[PDB]
Amino acid sequence: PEVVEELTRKTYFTEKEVQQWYKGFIKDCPSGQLDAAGFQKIYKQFFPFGDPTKFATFVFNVFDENKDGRIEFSEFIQALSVTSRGTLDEKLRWAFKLYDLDNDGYITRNEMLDIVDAIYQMVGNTVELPEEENTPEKRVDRIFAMMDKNADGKLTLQEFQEGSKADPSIVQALSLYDGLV
Amino acid sequence: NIEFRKAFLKILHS
Amino acid sequence: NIEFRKAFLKILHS
Ligand SMILES: [Ca+2]
Ligand SMILES: [Ca+2]
Ligand SMILES: [Ca+2]
Ligand SMILES: [K+]
């Protein structure tokens, strides 16, 4: 009611859009607060023949802005606002937070390996990769050295932004790909 | 609801 | 490769 107004101000959605998403959200999760378990179950539906645990959790952590172990509707709608309608910069910053697991402003080779491993665990079963990129390690070796222009083992936001524009395939798991291609 | 769940996953991944 | 991309597009079709 009054809260719809605030979330309309804080997102790129219209009031009717905020409420339509709320209906869906609350029908899907009546308690209005979904946890990492529920979130993994959501991915499991669409990726039943993989292990989506890891990737779901990494994605969950970006949604859970206040880090309280739940996604409340405000966090849910904001995540969707940014990823669907944000500027290209905003979307890249969102994907950066996904990869930046410890949230220290840098993506390490280890952090990217974890993300890429999680994606392979969830979806690898279904794709056929060229032999040179058929493991997380092979894929990361190439894309991380490509992006790490300071040769310091840690990717800044700028390095990640510039790297992904140059080679959109780096974020091929995200809708952001289509904004870069 | 699978169509709701599909809709928001699409925003993220499709 | 963009094989994961292609997969997501099919897997999350609607
Ligand atoms: Ca939260
Ligand atoms: Ca980090
Ligand atoms: Ca660097
Ligand atoms: K990947």
Residue numbers in the entry:
A (entry chain A): 10 to 190
B (entry chain B), C (entry chain C): 430 to 443
Authors' description from the paper:
Neuronal calcium sensor-1 (NCS-1) is the primordial member of the neuronal calcium sensor family of EF-hand Ca2+-binding proteins. It interacts with both the G-protein-coupled receptor (GPCR) dopamine D2 receptor (D2R), regulating its internalization and surface expression, and the cognate kinases GRK1 and GRK2. Consequently, in the Ca2+-bound state, NCS-1 folds in such a way that the two lobes are oriented to jointly present a large, solvent-exposed, concave hydrophobic crevice onto which peptide, proteins, and other hydrophobic molecules can dock and bind.
Diffraction data were collected from crystals of rat NCS-1 in complex with the D2R peptide, and the structure was determined to 2.19-Å resolution. The complex adopted a different crystal form from the NCS-1 structure without peptide bound, with one NCS-1 chain in the asymmetric unit. The most striking feature is that NCS-1 binds two copies of the D2R, one in the N-lobe site (referred to as peptide D2B) and the other in the C-lobe site (peptide D2C). Both peptides bind as amphipathic helices, with D2B forming a slightly longer helix than D2C. In summary, two molecules of the D2R peptides bind in the hydrophobic crevice of NCS-1, with the most significant conformational changes observed in the EF3/EF4 linker and the C-terminal region, which adopts a helix-loop-helix conformation in the complex. (iii) The C-terminal region partially occupies the C-lobe site in the D2R peptide complex, providing interaction sites for the peptide.
